[PDB]
């Protein structure tokens, strides 16, 4: 899909193996924010949001949190606290044809900067003057979309690049990567990884009642105390 209509897909209820993506080596940029690229195999999330689009290579930099630019401001703006990872790979051989590939289009003019993850599909003609032209583009009012016109001989900056932004949000776990589960052990100080929640302690059968919608119970200090029911206790420690 075109950048001005970047297409966002939902991924859930599956296992995502990011090791193959990391070691593919076919991606020009694999820049992961908030998560180390070789660290997602033990983690997992509620869902994955894959936003796909196409830009110029020189424009790959603009796709980043807190980055100012025409595309980043009026086509696809990431939040300042964005967590996820941006993948960009060159598609010149699949997107450039002799005579100019104008199928790729990007919106340029907009009255206000886009909010994070805010897709704008408005077809209204930008008004750059006091006098409205009533939708008939003319003086001081222009069409806000421009075409890339990719060419086979265009430079790296002008060569096309397909970009997929994977966004994660953690608010029960649904999509968890390739990590083999283990049998539960009780009454022994052990390291535990419950749906990507890592910790160490003793797990015991618990009598507290979790309502069907609750997953983990946190006591004071925001330290997890119970997890789906299992009571977590810091194994014996003290002074010597």
């Amino acid at each position, epitope marked *: 899909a075109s950048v001005y209509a970047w297409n966002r897909k939902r991924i859930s209820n599956c296992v995502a193996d990011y090791s193959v993506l990391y070691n593919s080596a076919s991606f020009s940029t694999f820049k992961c924010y908030g998560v180390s690229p070789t660290k997602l195999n033990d983690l997992c999330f509620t869902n994955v949001y894959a936003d796909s689009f196409v830009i110029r290579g020189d424009e790959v930099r603009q796709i980043a949190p807190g980055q100012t630019g025409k595309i980043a401001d009026y086509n696809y703006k990431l939040p300042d606290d964005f967590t996820g990872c941006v993948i960009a790979w060159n598609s010149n051989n699949l997107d450039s044809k002799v005579g100019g590939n104008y199928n790729y289009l990007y919106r340029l003019f907009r009255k206000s900067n886009l909010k994070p993850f805010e897709r704008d599909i408005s077809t209204e003609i930008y008004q750059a003057g006091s006098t409205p032209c009533n939708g008939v583009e003319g003086f001081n009012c222009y*069409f806000p979309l421009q075409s890339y016109g990719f060419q086979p001989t265009n430079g790296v900056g002008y060569q096309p690049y397909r970009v997929v932004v994977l966004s994660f949000e953690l608010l029960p776990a649904t999509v968890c990567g390739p990590k083999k589960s283990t049998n539960l052990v009780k009454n022994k100080c052990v390291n535990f990884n419950f749906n990507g929640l890592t910790g160490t302690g003793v797990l015991t059968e618990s009598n507290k009642k979790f309502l069907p919608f609750q997953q983990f119970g946190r006591d004071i200090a925001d330290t997890t105390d119970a997890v789906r029911i299992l009571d977590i206790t810091p194994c014996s420690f003290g002074g010597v």
Partner: nanobody
Framework: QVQLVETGGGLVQPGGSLRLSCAAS????????MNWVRQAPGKGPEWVSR????????GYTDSVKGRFTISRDNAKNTLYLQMNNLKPEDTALYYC???????????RGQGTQVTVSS
């Protein structure tokens, strides 16, 4: 994803006025007009013609007076370029762009090569 699908233009012999259709989709057309632009091998693009949506004035370069005209239809949402006394030198790429006063390196379609076969 607005698609400026343009009808292909086959080889036509001199003596018959040639019509070239040019369509689009994915956006309102009665509000935005389109401009026809002629590009040739060995030289850059050349702005050919424009038509206003409301006034409907066909404006095109003096060097082409009397041999090119346009006709737009909102019902079918397309344009038709009519040219008479077509000559071999008209071998060209007649593509469409979203009409703008500047009409310089704006959005444009892939166009179709049309040549008059003597």
């Amino acid at each position: 994803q607005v698609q400026l699908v343009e009808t292909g233009g086959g080889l036509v012999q001199p003596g018959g006025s040639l019509r070239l259709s040019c369509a689009a989709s994915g956006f309102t057309f009665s509000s935005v007009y389109m401009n026809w632009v002629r590009q040739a091998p060995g030289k850059g693009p050349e702005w050919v013609s424009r038509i206003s949506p409301n006034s409907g004035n066909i404006g095109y370069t003096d060097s082409v007076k009397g041999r090119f005209t346009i006709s737009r239809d909102n019902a079918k949402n397309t344009l038709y370029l009519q040219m008479n006394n077509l000559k071999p030198e008209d071998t060209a790429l007649y593509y469409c762009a979203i009409g703008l006063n500047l009409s310089s390196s704006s959005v444009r379609g892939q166009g179709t090569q049309v040549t008059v076969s003597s």
